[model samples]
Target: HMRKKLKAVLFDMDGVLFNSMPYHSEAWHQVMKTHGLDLSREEAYMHNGRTGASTINIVFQRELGKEATQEEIESIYHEKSILFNSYPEAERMPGAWELLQKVKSEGLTPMVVTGSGQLSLLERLEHNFPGMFHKELMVTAFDVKYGKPNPEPYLMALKKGGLKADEAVVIENAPLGVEAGHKAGIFTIAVNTGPLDGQVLLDAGADLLFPSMQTLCDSWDTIML
Candidate 1:
């Protein structure tokens, strides 16, 4: 296959843009515990790119031997959201803003591809990175029927960016997000911002791996150019 000029960068929000995965994992664990389910922090990281309902159902089926009802899923997710929001506001990942600025300076479109459907998180993005992203340039859980490990989210991002898979690169910190980007036929860069082993991301098909977003940002000139 011929290479296309890189015109866009698709980013995963939770671990890539904001350091919010810890909060998410804690919330999921607390909520699931109330429902008589057990979820490890590591397992929560593995489920990073899936929708809340999907994650709830997966754990429910695994622990309870049956899928959760829609009402149960909604209730669990609502409680999880409440717990998550009760925490201190999320902050941008280290060097995230700098990388975004560099990408914009280079005239490449930067878009978010995430499994998050939280309005507060969306608003935070707007407030934190003024004018960097708009609704049309974001591919969220609401925009796709299937979540990561399915490739639909990244595919939607490419469509929104008006670029082919070869014309975009995906920056993701989640294993499933890396897999999705690869499945979408885009070059995937993995930044190990969470607790997962580096080999996990590599096994999921990351074309490049960095120890942290800061490292990636420092190497931006070499990588992006």
Candidate 2:
């Protein structure tokens, strides 16, 4: 028997909708190295699904004694954004557009649930996907004090969408995001779009895992059950 009716498809934007994680990771890796912080690109991906300041503060606290100052956080994030933008604009993730259309055609509202505080990227959503998302239906880093690996972000997403946990399926590519979605008591699909082993996502509690978004789109109907 099926579970509750699926009313919405909640998405994590960076690696799910947009192939922007590579650029984001690279920027973090490069920027942190400049500050004498030791972050490899692989480690950056491991830290995905956190807000820039959260990520920076975590590293700063570990490398330094305490969290970064507000000014330090602002400057570090500002540099990362500039570095991210210097790369060619990120392309959409493979098959993401197709899956979004399918979700919409299935009478499911699509909502963005992300830890990104990057306004440059946020402002591009409507431009990239047209009418798929509404401001009120979306949850961002600004909406939650806690980031992924914690359930608060997804909890907020459910609240904003007026959905019960069983009423939505979370699409995420980061392990931390999977953890957040699953902990929030929703069905979570993890797409392996980065270098991490797919098992990492499963370990984080993904109900299902796909090798790529294209594969997920192809089997959307089968998975929805």
Candidate 3:
């Protein structure tokens, strides 16, 4: 009874596909401490799914009362990466990989669209879900000038995957990513892995919301276009 017009599915990396938000939060906490800034968990949560440099930039500027030099920001960013790497608990979100497998079995192309830098994304994927996706199918922040909330990344992902906007379903865990999908005129499914609530995602333009990949899989046929 549920049919969608989707031919491709674009996934967000850190929160939606993998539960990396904790590691990210820890990393940010440590870095902020080093920068003489004390950020609460709520602030860290708000930074989820954003680029490392962008996160550092905002925190540094807001806390330090000045924009950081590129070199200073890079140092903080590098430190955060080291801290995140120490966690090593990186794994796919509940039922995430399974959902991708199901989509492929249903003849839909699966692609990753992320704000994470390419090198970091590859490192995490290799460490966590070895050979899970074709290396070529992933699109990173490096591929575009604008990040989430901007339709450029999602648009680029569709082009790279050889699909039209109307033919793809975007799986996002953040409001900005959902905004991007809606702006690009694609279907968006928001997973409550990041800071935003299900209703907030809908408000940001998501077509649907699932608490986790397991829920989505249980209702896969209904979600598929």
Instruction: Choose the strongest candidate by lDDT.
Output: 2
User: Which residue window of length 10 is worst by lDDT in model 3?
Assistant: 126-135
Residue 51 accuracy (lDDT) in model 2: 83
lDDT tens digits by residue: candidate 1, 1-225: 322387888989999889999999998888988878899877898999988878888998888899899999889988999999999998999899999998898888889999898778978998888768988999987898879988988988888888898899899998888999999999999999998889999999999999999999998777644
The C-alpha lDDT values of all candidates are: 0.89, 0.90, 0.77
**Candidate 1 at residue 98, lDDT?**
91
Q: Better model by TM-score, 2 or 3?
A: 2
TM-score list, all predictions: 0.96, 0.96, 0.89
Model 2, C-alpha of 26: deviation from truth (Å): 0.7
Give stretches of model 1 more than 4 Å off. Answer: 1-4
Worst 10 residues of 1 by lDDT: 1-10
Which lDDT tens digits does candidate 3 get at residues 13-104? 87877887777777788888877888766678766656766777778778878777889768888887787877766677888877877887
